[PDB]
Amino acid sequence: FEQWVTDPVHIRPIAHAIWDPHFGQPAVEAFTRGGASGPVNISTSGVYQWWYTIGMRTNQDLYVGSVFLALVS
Amino acid sequence: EVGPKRGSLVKILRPESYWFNQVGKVVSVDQSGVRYPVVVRFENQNYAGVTTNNYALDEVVAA
Amino acid sequence: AHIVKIYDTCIGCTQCVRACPLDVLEMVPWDGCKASQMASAPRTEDCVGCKRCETACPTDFLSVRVYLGSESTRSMGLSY
Amino acid sequence: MKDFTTYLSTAPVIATIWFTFTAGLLIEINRYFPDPLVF
Amino acid sequence: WTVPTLNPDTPSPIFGGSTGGLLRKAQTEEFYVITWEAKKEQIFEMPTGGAAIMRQGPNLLKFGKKEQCLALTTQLRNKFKLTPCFYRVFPDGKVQYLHPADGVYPEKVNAGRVGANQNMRRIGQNVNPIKVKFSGRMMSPAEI
Amino acid sequence: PFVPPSWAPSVFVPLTGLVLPAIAMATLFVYIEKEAP
Amino acid sequence: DIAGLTPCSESKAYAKLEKKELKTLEKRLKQYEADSAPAVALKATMERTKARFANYAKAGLLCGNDGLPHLIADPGLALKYGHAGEVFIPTFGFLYVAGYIGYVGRQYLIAVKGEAKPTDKEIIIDVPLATKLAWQGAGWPLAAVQELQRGTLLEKEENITVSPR
Amino acid sequence: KVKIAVDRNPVETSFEKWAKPGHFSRTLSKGPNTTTWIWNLHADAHDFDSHTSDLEEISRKVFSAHFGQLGIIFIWLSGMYFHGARFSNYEAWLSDPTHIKPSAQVVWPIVGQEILNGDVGGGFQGIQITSGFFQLWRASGITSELQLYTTAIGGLVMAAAMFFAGWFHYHKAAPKLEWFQNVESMLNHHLGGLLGLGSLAWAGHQIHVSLPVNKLLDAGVDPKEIPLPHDLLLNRAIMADLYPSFAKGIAPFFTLNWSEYSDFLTFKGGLNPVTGGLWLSDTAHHHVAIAVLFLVAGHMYRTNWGIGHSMKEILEAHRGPFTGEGHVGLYEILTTSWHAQLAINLALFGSLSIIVAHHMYAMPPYPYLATDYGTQLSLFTHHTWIGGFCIVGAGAHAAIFMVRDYDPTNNYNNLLDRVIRHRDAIISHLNWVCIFLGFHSFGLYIHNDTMSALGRPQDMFSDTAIQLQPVFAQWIQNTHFLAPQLTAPNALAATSLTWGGDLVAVGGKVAMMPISLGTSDFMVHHIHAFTIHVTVLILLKGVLFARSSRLIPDKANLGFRFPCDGPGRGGTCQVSAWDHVFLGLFWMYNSLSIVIFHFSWKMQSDVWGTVTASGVSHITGGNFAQSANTINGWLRDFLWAQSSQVIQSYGSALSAYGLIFLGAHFVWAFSLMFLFSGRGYWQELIESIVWAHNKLKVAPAIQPRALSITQGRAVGVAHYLLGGIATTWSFFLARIISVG
Ligand code: CLA
Ligand code: CLA
Ligand code: CLA
Ligand code: CLA
Ligand code: CLA
Ligand code: CLA
Ligand SMILES: CC1=C(/C=C/C(C)=C/C=C/C(C)=C/C=C\C=C(C)\C=C\C=C(C)\C=C\C2=C(C)C[C@@H](O)CC2(C)C)C(C)(C)CCC1
Ligand code: SF4
Ligand code: SF4
Ligand code: SF4
């Protein structure tokens, strides 16, 4: 998120990391992207543009919100 | 001799009847005190293929 | 067990009793129809829900009605 | 002959004849008035 | 007429056996035993599959469910004009006579029989489900 | 900030999707097979 | 003209499509001798193609950027801009034929209903009666209005069956 | 005593019944009251058994119905020969068969449909045919449209004779039951006359017409200057020049000097290098041997003399310690039940139609048939489909017999009775075999798909990764290939090039070459085993449980075709033997769809292809071996890649295949409406529509009714097979004609 905000036109949003022990070394490389950091899935939900539009700018902001909503649940 | 005349055409009034608002012919009316004494015959068969049914005097009206 | 019910529209044709493949019905003396007999359902616990009785019923609407209910080894017609 | 004409009056026969007539009529029209898109 | 007693040592029709016979239910829950008298040895069809020869005089067979017994009862009565009777047998030795319950086949009206599950109304006179709602359990307007 | 360690997935993914399912299935199957007193 | 469309007569795409179509037919007409039956057939298709492109343009059809004729279905735009032979007139032509079939069939069913075995007259068609009604169907529209005004076209609800409700 | 017995003037020839629809049925003759009557009339039209309980009357109806079929087939053949004489490019194709495409259907120029008249060659424009008639006519030695026209007229004379025979043997001289029950006599005539005489006569035509005419055609002689067949039949010197042994006449035959006829009766094997088809001399010696073999076979059954065998005696004699009474009762069942005969005949005839597809493709019997890939693919697929349908029909009529003609009094402790007594063992064991095949066949494809997606190709089942080689089939191929030198010394070459050896090329295209079998072949052969085993499971179960089951003990009383026994016992939907045939059709379609797809890809990938300088280029470049081991491989490299021809056919002569391709996808989806729905919903919807018709006084006397449950199932399966098979048909023909 802190990299997508810098270049939202060319950076692909990451949904979450992929931990699959059935993967082969080629699959690990094919799914490694979005600043590398290991195999990850790109997000098509639109939360990156949404949170960015509403003022979210840092992972600290995202972390705090997560805690709040967990408390609300 | 209670009931409609034999051979007369009457319209069914029983709501759950296949011939509701339809006209049939009075085959016979049982003078004995049966719950449904009017035997009516219809040209169109029902979903079961039956073309006759018994109705009470109130369930039938000349039409 | 399935709920089997007989209605006053019964004409005492006995067709349902002859069609039943599990002996759930029988004919009992009656005074409401010319046949002086009406169908009864004293063994519904053996009913499976085939609805053959309803197929045999010639009245409009049906005088015998089957309502599928709680399922048992007999209701599911299980030989195991 | 009367029974034969009754057989020729049966639903399928009449349908074949009527549809053959209607198809033919439409085909001939497009044969003499080709590519009819508008009135 | 009196309730008949099932003689379990009755001769069984000649049959080499099949794979459609009784299962573990016969030993844990219950099984059914049909009995009839034959005036002549006649080959017949086992409702469980296969041909079998009925023996002269007494005959006894065991089926897994009541429907199989009544199915054989239908064939013997309709084709051979015989009059069979069947019972439900529990694994504790208890026997329960089932058909004909009063010795008179159900289709033939018989005295003493008391009506059951009969409604003094036509189906079109049943109440709307809204009336039988919030009762002890799921029920139909017909049950009331 | 509220960041789990790198081994998190190496442990969380195994537990959630294999171990926990087995535990859940075990207790659930027992309850269904249990009969009313 | 309307919707930003352009007359097929002035569309360049319409002209290119006609050339493209004739060039396919010509590339094939070559492999055959001049009088060969194949050659005669390809020539008649080329003539029919030329007549179609010309007839469509003369009819004043409008063409989109695809160079294909588009049909105007608004009664107002069609009448004011000369496009009524595209959907309006066809509509009244079909409605007349379709009502013709319906009114004749209804007249047949009503006639056979008063017979001994209506079901028999539906599997075996009373041809003479059917032909008579077929010819008398030309004036169906006026007959349908006269039935609508006498209250004989519809059935009384009291005589029509319905479910319990 | 075997003898001709008939009844005179049994049925009057009047149109009285023609005007009384449903006259044949006691229930239908009353006339229609609802729309169900119309369907019932057509559905019960050819069910004579249900019409009458008289076997003699049923047998007479069957005999005349067969003459009607034979007349229909003759008209069909006359049309094909007529269209070859008046609407075809056969004479031009005879001169240039390697370039001109066979065409025998020309369309009228209307609504722009003339585009379908493609440039097939030879100065002709029409639809390209794939029936293989041009190659059959060339093999027969036809060189003129006059011969095709004369055969067409002959076929119509034969069709008129067949229809006459049908009317005569039903209304004038109807054979009695005893006549039809002469099975021993029928087999003797069908083996000796129909088969042996038919083969002998054909050998006559081949030796006196097919061999010299085709030898001259292969030598390069123009079809116009070839001697007419009669010239060869009335002159021995011409035949002697072409075949020296003809100068000796028929002396060598009666003197047992058969070796002299070695020039026309041969055992070459392999393929004619000029045409790519089997040697006609080999086909001639074959039909002569077939004729002799079948003439002997037709002298085995006893008739009106003591010599011969009694089928009842033979059957009653074959009994063993494990099978009780044995084949007792079968003679009575197969002489009093047509459904029993139809079951066995449909089973073998379908299995045969499938065997013809494999044998005709591997050993191409007609000249220039092998390099015509459109015709080759069409023939194999067509005969494969006919076989599968007949096999499913065999199942249905076996169940019809079990439900209507089975009598326990005649089947006590016999093979039939003992089979019904262990039906649960049979179905349960077959059930497990089906589950084992499914996992070990389709599970392998899933493993490969997952391993490839996970980027682990070394963990896949392939000719480069883990290998599953069909060793047994590889050994058989090697044995058949080396056969000529050891086990078949006289034969010059092996029966087919598929076994191995050198490839035969005609017109620059591969006629036939060796077909290699690897892991992908091993995997698809096991899918076939699974699909066939499962289809058998459904059909067999439907037949063995047709009379009764643990769920329903009186299924036989309910009949063969019945919707269910109600929602009781949990639900008894589709318990009838007819419903098993309904389900069997879907699996038969699934099996054969996979079989024909396998054939098309394998042939386009490893056999068919242009032969160039130092190398053969196949149509798909040999991608079957490395692309047919995954479902993704099948979907991408077969369906998606080869659908390009049908999807890009618009604006051309194959445009019809594109339209049919879409129309077929439509019919298939339209079937799902009937297959997933129930009549209860439709009946109610019709009720509201009927209301509108009642309101406007336009309601029909014949009450509209939703289709019966069984009709709903029958309509659904019909549209499913029609749509699905037609879709493959359009895909196959467009693809093959374009890249042929
Ligand atoms: C059935 C749906 C439908 C729809 C969506 C339209 C839509 C339209 N119609 Mg219309 N029309 C219809 C049915 C319909 N029509 C029918 C059944 C008839 C037969 C009588 C007509 C006869 C008709 C005429 C005579 C005219 C239109 C016109 C128009 C356009 C402007 C009309 C307007 O202002 O509001 C929409 C109209 C309706 C919702 C119903 C009918 C149209 C009204 C009655 C016409 C009033 C137009 C008015 C003068 C506004 C335009 C001013 C000026 C440019 C003429 C418009 C796009 C006008 C036009 O653009 O001509 C160039 C025009 O004058 N229509
Ligand atoms: C006399 C014939 C006739 C007439 C006058 C009508 C009239 C009507 N039908 Mg209808 N219908 C008919 C026959 C007829 N139908 C037949 C044979 C069928 C079986 C397919 C149906 C099935 C049918 C359905 C499913 C529906 C209607 C509906 C309707 C109503 C809406 C308008 C409409 O036509 O929708 C379209 C109707 C059709 C597309 C059916 C086409 C039937 C053909 C074209 C008629 C031919 C009749 C006969 C062969 C001619 C005999 C002539 C005689 C001289 C021998 C309307 C009042 C709709 C409705 O209820 O709306 C309220 C509706 O949903 N009909
Ligand atoms: C003018 C000659 C003639 C006449 C007047 C009759 C008259 C009669 N025949 Mg008959 N018959 C004839 C010729 C004739 N037949 C011939 C040539 C054959 C040999 C095939 C038969 C074989 C035959 C049999 C086996 C039976 C009769 C029966 C009957 C009687 C009632 C059945 C009937 O005809 O209804 C009319 C029936 C039809 C009009 C159906 C036509 C069948 C044709 C051949 C099917 C054509 C299908 C087509 C090729 C493909 C359709 C595909 C689709 C897409 C369009 C009746 C009195 C039946 C009987 O005795 O009464 C119980 C009986 O079982 N006939
Ligand atoms: C040499 C003796 C002979 C021959 C050649 C045939 C040939 C045939 N029989 Mg057959 N049959 C025979 C003796 C013979 N039969 C005897 C002795 C009996 C009594 C036991 C029967 C009883 C019998 C029955 C019950 C049936 C047949 C049927 C058939 C046909 C099956 C269709 C087929 O596969 O062939 C393909 C078709 C052809 C090759 C067309 C050529 C057929 C021509 C006409 C050859 C002539 C055959 C005929 C017997 C010759 C005498 C005709 C004369 C009376 C005018 C077939 C043409 C079936 C049928 O219905 O046929 C209508 C059938 O059901 N036959
Ligand atoms: C159905 C199979 C068949 C048929 C029809 C023929 C037919 C023929 N073969 Mg042949 N052949 C066959 C199979 C057949 N073959 C096979 C399988 C082989 C491989 C062994 C051969 C190998 C072979 C050779 C090597 C030769 C022939 C030859 C011939 C021709 C001369 C036969 C002959 O010499 O006298 C045969 C005797 C008769 C045919 C008896 C005739 C009886 C007549 C027709 C009865 C008329 C009666 C009537 C009442 C008269 C009144 C008439 C009326 C106007 C009043 C002849 C047309 C010879 C040939 O080609 O000649 C050029 C020859 O060289 N064949
Ligand atoms: C020699 C082959 C043969 C013969 C002689 C018979 C004979 C018979 N079969 Mg049978 N059958 C066969 C093969 C054969 N079958 C095969 C291969 C199958 C597997 C699919 C079946 C499956 C089958 C079933 C499931 C049933 C029969 C039944 C019957 C009996 C009544 C037939 C009937 O219902 O009439 C009427 C025939 C029709 C109404 C024809 C329907 C139209 C067809 C199916 C449409 C096919 C598509 C068509 C080509 C589309 C054309 C294009 C379109 C646009 C028009 C009859 C004695 C029935 C029976 O035994 O009664 C209990 C029955 O239920 N057959
Ligand atoms: C007489 C006849 C029959 C008809 C019977 C009956 C009762 C038909 C019922 C008609 C009814 C109730 C119609 C009700 C409302 C109709 C309305 C509001 C009309 C809508 C038409 C509109 C808005 C026009 C649209 C356009 C026009 C100007 C024409 C075209 O340009 C196309 C378009 C859409 C632009 C039987 C028996 C079916 C048998 C047969 C002959
Ligand atoms: S549903 Fe079946 S078992 Fe129950 S009463 Fe009716 S016929 Fe008997
Ligand atoms: S079938 Fe109906 S009317 Fe007849 S006895 Fe049974 S319940 Fe009564
Ligand atoms: S859903 Fe249809 S087929 Fe199944 S039990 Fe009910 S009525 Fe019979």
PDB file of C-alpha atoms in Angstrom, chain H residues 90-155:
ATOM      1  CA  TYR H  90     -17.419 -37.694 -60.374  1.00  0.00           C
ATOM      2  CA  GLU H  91     -16.264 -37.887 -64.034  1.00  0.00           C
ATOM      3  CA  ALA H  92     -13.760 -35.044 -63.484  1.00  0.00           C
ATOM      4  CA  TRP H  93     -12.698 -36.488 -60.123  1.00  0.00           C
ATOM      5  CA  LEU H  94     -12.036 -39.836 -61.868  1.00  0.00           C
ATOM      6  CA  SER H  95      -9.426 -38.071 -64.038  1.00  0.00           C
ATOM      7  CA  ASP H  96      -7.936 -36.001 -61.177  1.00  0.00           C
ATOM      8  CA  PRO H  97      -8.770 -37.618 -57.812  1.00  0.00           C
ATOM      9  CA  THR H  98      -5.800 -36.099 -55.904  1.00  0.00           C
ATOM     10  CA  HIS H  99      -6.936 -32.476 -56.446  1.00  0.00           C
ATOM     11  CA  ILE H 100     -10.672 -32.422 -57.193  1.00  0.00           C
ATOM     12  CA  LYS H 101     -12.869 -32.605 -54.083  1.00  0.00           C
ATOM     13  CA  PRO H 102     -15.899 -34.935 -54.265  1.00  0.00           C
ATOM     14  CA  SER H 103     -19.192 -33.011 -54.487  1.00  0.00           C
ATOM     15  CA  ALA H 104     -22.729 -34.364 -55.174  1.00  0.00           C
ATOM     16  CA  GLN H 105     -25.043 -31.713 -53.618  1.00  0.00           C
ATOM     17  CA  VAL H 106     -25.763 -28.448 -55.524  1.00  0.00           C
ATOM     18  CA  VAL H 107     -27.926 -25.725 -53.860  1.00  0.00           C
ATOM     19  CA  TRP H 108     -30.403 -23.443 -55.729  1.00  0.00           C
ATOM     20  CA  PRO H 109     -29.445 -19.706 -55.953  1.00  0.00           C
ATOM     21  CA  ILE H 110     -31.899 -18.174 -53.403  1.00  0.00           C
ATOM     22  CA  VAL H 111     -31.690 -15.777 -50.374  1.00  0.00           C
ATOM     23  CA  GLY H 112     -27.907 -15.781 -51.069  1.00  0.00           C
ATOM     24  CA  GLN H 113     -27.397 -19.481 -50.175  1.00  0.00           C
ATOM     25  CA  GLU H 114     -25.484 -20.186 -53.466  1.00  0.00           C
ATOM     26  CA  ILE H 115     -22.276 -19.302 -51.506  1.00  0.00           C
ATOM     27  CA  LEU H 116     -22.474 -22.932 -50.204  1.00  0.00           C
ATOM     28  CA  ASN H 117     -21.628 -24.080 -53.791  1.00  0.00           C
ATOM     29  CA  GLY H 118     -17.871 -24.079 -53.169  1.00  0.00           C
ATOM     30  CA  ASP H 119     -15.189 -24.324 -55.866  1.00  0.00           C
ATOM     31  CA  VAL H 120     -14.623 -28.081 -55.448  1.00  0.00           C
ATOM     32  CA  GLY H 121     -12.719 -28.358 -58.737  1.00  0.00           C
ATOM     33  CA  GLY H 122     -13.317 -29.934 -62.114  1.00  0.00           C
ATOM     34  CA  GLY H 123     -15.291 -26.934 -63.330  1.00  0.00           C
ATOM     35  CA  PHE H 124     -17.919 -27.707 -60.702  1.00  0.00           C
ATOM     36  CA  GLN H 125     -19.508 -25.794 -57.780  1.00  0.00           C
ATOM     37  CA  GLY H 126     -21.273 -27.633 -54.956  1.00  0.00           C
ATOM     38  CA  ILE H 127     -21.166 -28.874 -51.367  1.00  0.00           C
ATOM     39  CA  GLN H 128     -18.208 -31.164 -50.617  1.00  0.00           C
ATOM     40  CA  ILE H 129     -19.440 -34.637 -49.560  1.00  0.00           C
ATOM     41  CA  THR H 130     -17.604 -36.945 -47.079  1.00  0.00           C
ATOM     42  CA  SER H 131     -19.745 -40.127 -47.490  1.00  0.00           C
ATOM     43  CA  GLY H 132     -16.971 -41.781 -49.580  1.00  0.00           C
ATOM     44  CA  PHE H 133     -19.334 -42.658 -52.480  1.00  0.00           C
ATOM     45  CA  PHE H 134     -16.847 -41.416 -55.144  1.00  0.00           C
ATOM     46  CA  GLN H 135     -14.166 -43.868 -53.883  1.00  0.00           C
ATOM     47  CA  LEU H 136     -16.750 -46.706 -53.552  1.00  0.00           C
ATOM     48  CA  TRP H 137     -17.943 -46.108 -57.171  1.00  0.00           C
ATOM     49  CA  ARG H 138     -14.329 -46.018 -58.406  1.00  0.00           C
ATOM     50  CA  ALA H 139     -13.590 -49.286 -56.562  1.00  0.00           C
ATOM     51  CA  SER H 140     -16.713 -50.857 -58.158  1.00  0.00           C
ATOM     52  CA  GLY H 141     -15.331 -49.744 -61.568  1.00  0.00           C
ATOM     53  CA  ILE H 142     -18.001 -47.115 -62.436  1.00  0.00           C
ATOM     54  CA  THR H 143     -16.552 -44.665 -65.034  1.00  0.00           C
ATOM     55  CA  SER H 144     -19.694 -42.862 -66.351  1.00  0.00           C
ATOM     56  CA  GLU H 145     -22.715 -40.933 -64.981  1.00  0.00           C
ATOM     57  CA  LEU H 146     -24.779 -43.295 -67.205  1.00  0.00           C
ATOM     58  CA  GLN H 147     -23.869 -46.237 -64.895  1.00  0.00           C
ATOM     59  CA  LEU H 148     -24.809 -44.157 -61.785  1.00  0.00           C
ATOM     60  CA  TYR H 149     -28.146 -43.146 -63.431  1.00  0.00           C
ATOM     61  CA  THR H 150     -28.932 -46.804 -64.364  1.00  0.00           C
ATOM     62  CA  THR H 151     -28.217 -48.003 -60.771  1.00  0.00           C
ATOM     63  CA  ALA H 152     -30.452 -45.169 -59.441  1.00  0.00           C
ATOM     64  CA  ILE H 153     -33.345 -46.427 -61.657  1.00  0.00           C
ATOM     65  CA  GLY H 154     -32.598 -49.997 -60.472  1.00  0.00           C
ATOM     66  CA  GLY H 155     -32.761 -48.904 -56.806  1.00  0.00           C
TER      67      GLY H 155
END
